Design a protein around this ligand. Structure first.
Ligand SMILES: O=S(=O)(O)[C@]1(CNC2CCCCC2)C[C@@H](O)[C@@H](O)C1
Length: 658
């Protein structure tokens, strides 16, 4: 089908453009598609890009509009007072503003389908909403429509929602074009997706990106594949990985590094309305917050993540219990059997389940996958699925049997309801991952596990030392291994906050000198330095010139391999904002060789100050470009929960930064 109207290069400079004569009498039938390529790098707070309205006195509420906000939100209104219909559909964080100093051409496709009674919006190749209604209102069947407008809506003769931006191309069709047809429309995206809705994970949501450049040149990424909306644990979340062998140009279909199967991997559209949006999968085990390092010694890749038993997250984890029992200098995983009121069991060497009241082995063992065996025979549990068919969240058995795991709700033997850290390794650079092992507790029997800092671990350049930053109340707790992650020791570093989410990332400034940058509750990013490969740590200082919110956001950090302005360089990625998670920046600092202080010299705005930027991952690609995988939305805001395909990847060169 050919367009019934096509036009382009319209400048919207706070003055609408009337295209009624060109468009109105071409509109026919009850189904329409609008295709629009547009730029808006300095949008007004709220502005219409396109409008069809009744401009007459008395009919102010009779119009169709496609509108955007300076927050990045896109949406439509479809309104007809006579019909008693006022439809508004939208999604936050759907737009790009600028990339590498140039306004981004967004590609918008809106489909109004009378046959299916469905309105669907795509932006930059991503479906941001699809809504079916009982009473369909065709966009050009609004009573008394007499104006077609760009850059405003004509209401009662006056310009409402005046726009600043440009419409490079606009086309309309008297048909609802298929999803297939939509896929053929060319895009001008400044970004790519590594993980995405409908991929191999079957998670509709993702959070907590990581990136790490391996010695082979392979670039590896990990992520929370989150099934029950974007909620932190408790939920169902797996850890997924993908890699690129061509400097980030293309990426492998994701596989899992850590997964549980007590609940089905379901691609679910999580409700965003105020009544149901806090619906949360409450009986599933999960993993959350991963971190990657490569070991030069063995060549193995190592990935850690937090582990949460069924129904457990940070909010309800038992804080006074590691989940392990100390018996003769060694730590053993505690287990509670169905029916008991105490944890009367432990898991000893070779997975033998021991009875603590009788100090005798049982006929039960735990295999490498933390699954329960009786007499060497695999026990099973029935898997759960979730649905909203009854109007609220339901979690129910689905008929399928899966191996019984001690992290599950339905297991005969269950671990302590608290948080743990696990580790897995890969011997083929992310092509497959081993079964995960639990790390031991580092701060005693009666202290819950520390929390992994998402992102990268640190491999020291001049030794075989590996360090993973973690945090808990009152300190950073660095985990240190000198034997390829076979054994770990802690190095504690006090910080001046209680109960902070002190997400920390490290860079090696020079041989044995580690600077750690971390999130606080002060509105400023902090740092500390070690000069002995992580054995001891300095007092805490703070970075000026960057602002965060009171609650803070993860900061990612790397040491760049090449000199910049003749100096060693570190690069930080963070939102720069005191208001919310937005205003994403890369900040380039040069190291003063005389005292290791850093002059934060260059700031690169990832996109508009008002557009979303939350958790982030950066890595120096093998060709010396910079890869950034980041949450392009406000992942703190309760208005921006459960958005799909907002974790995005871009490629930058150093010259773009400076
Ligand atoms: O120096 S490493 O710690 O081994 C690392 C890799 N640097 C290479 C060497 C220079 C070319 C590309 C990046 C930096 C971390 O951010 C990880 O991506 C791993």
């Amino acid at each position: 089908i050919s367009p019934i109207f096509q036009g382009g290069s319209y400048q919207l400079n706070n003055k609408s453009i009337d295209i009624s004569s060109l468009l109105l009498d071409k509109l026919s039938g009850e189904s329409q598609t609008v295709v629009m390529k547009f730029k808006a790098d300095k949008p007004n707070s709220l502005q219409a890009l396109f409008g069809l309205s009744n401009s007459k006195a008395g009919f102010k509420n009779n119009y169709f509009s496609i509108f955007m906000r300076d927050s990045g939100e896109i949406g439509v209104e479809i309104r007809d007072a006579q019909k008693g219909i006022n439809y508004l559909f939208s999604r936050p964080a759907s737009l790009w503003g600028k990339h590498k100093g140039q306004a981004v051409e967004n590609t918008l496709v809106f489909v109004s389908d009378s046959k299916d009674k469905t309105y669907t919006m795509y932006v930059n190749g991503i479906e941001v909403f699809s809504e079916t209604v009982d009473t369909f209102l065709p966009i050009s069947n609004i009573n008394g429509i007499d104006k077609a407008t760009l850059g405003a809506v004509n209401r009662e003769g006056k310009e409402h929602y005046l726009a600043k931006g440009s419409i490079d191309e606009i086309s309309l069709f008297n048909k609802a074009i298929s999803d297939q047809e939509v896929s053929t429309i060319p895009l001008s995206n400044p970004f790519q997706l590594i993980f995405q809705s409908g991929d191999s994970t079957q998670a509709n949501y993702f959070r907590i990106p990581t990136l790490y450049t391996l010695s082979s040149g392979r670039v590896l990424s990990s992520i929370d594949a989150r099934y029950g909306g974007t909620h932190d644990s408790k939920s169902k979340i797996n850890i997924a990985t993908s890699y690129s062998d061509d400097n980030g140009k293309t990426w492998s279909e994701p596989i899992f590094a850590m997964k549980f199967n007590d609940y089905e991997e379901q691609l679910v559209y999580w409700p965003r309305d105020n009544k149901l949006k806090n619906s949360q999968i409450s009986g599933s085990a999960s993993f959350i917050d991963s971190s990657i390092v490569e070991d030069k010694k063995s060549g193995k890749t190592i990935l850690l993540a937090d582990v949460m038993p069924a129904g457990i997250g940070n909010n309800n984890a038992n804080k006074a219990d590691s989940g392990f029992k100390e018996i003769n200098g060694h730590y053993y995983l505690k287990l509670k059997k169905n029916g008991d009121n105490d944890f009367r069991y432990t898991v000893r060497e070779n997975g033998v389940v021991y009875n603590e009241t009788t100090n005798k082995p049982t006929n039960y063992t735990i295999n490498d996958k933390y699954e329960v065996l009786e007499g060497g025979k695999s026990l099973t549990v029935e898997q759960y699925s979730v649905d909203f068919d009854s109007g609220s969240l339901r979690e129910r058995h689905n008929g399928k049997q899966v191996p019984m795991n001690v992290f599950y709700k339905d297991s005969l033997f269950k671990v302590t309801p608290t948080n743990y850290i696990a580790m897995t390794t890969s011997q083929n650079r992310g092509e497959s991952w081993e079964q995960f092992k639990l790390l031991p507790p580092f701060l005693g029997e009666k202290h819950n596990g520390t929390y992994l800092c998402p992102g990268q671990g640190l491999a020291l350049g001049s030794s075989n030392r590996l360090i993973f930053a973690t945090y808990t109340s009152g300190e950073l707790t660095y985990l240190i291994s000198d034997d390829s992650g076979q054994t770990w020791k802690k190095s504690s570093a006090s910080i001046p906050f209680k109960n902070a989410t002190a997400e920390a990332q490290m860079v090696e400034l020079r041989d044995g000198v580690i600077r750690t940058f971390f999130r606080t509750t002060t509105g400023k990013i902090a740092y500390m330095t070690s000069r002995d490969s992580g054995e001891t740590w300095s007092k805490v200082s703070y970075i000026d010139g960057i602002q965060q919110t009171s609650y803070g956001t993860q900061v990612s950090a790397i040491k760049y391999s090449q000199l910049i302005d003749g100096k060693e360089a570190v690069i930080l990625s963070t939102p720069n904002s005191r208001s919310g998670r937005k205003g994403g920046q890369l900040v380039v600092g040069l190291v003063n060789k005389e005292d290791d202080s850093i002059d934060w010299k260059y700031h690169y705005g990832i996109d508009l100050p008002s557009y979303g930027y939350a958790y982030s991952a950066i890595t120096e690609l093998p060709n010396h470009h910079i890869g950034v995988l980041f949450e392009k939305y406000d992942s703190w805001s309760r208005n921006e929960l459960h958005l799909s395909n907002v974790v995005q990847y871009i490629d930058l060169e150093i010259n773009d930064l400076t």
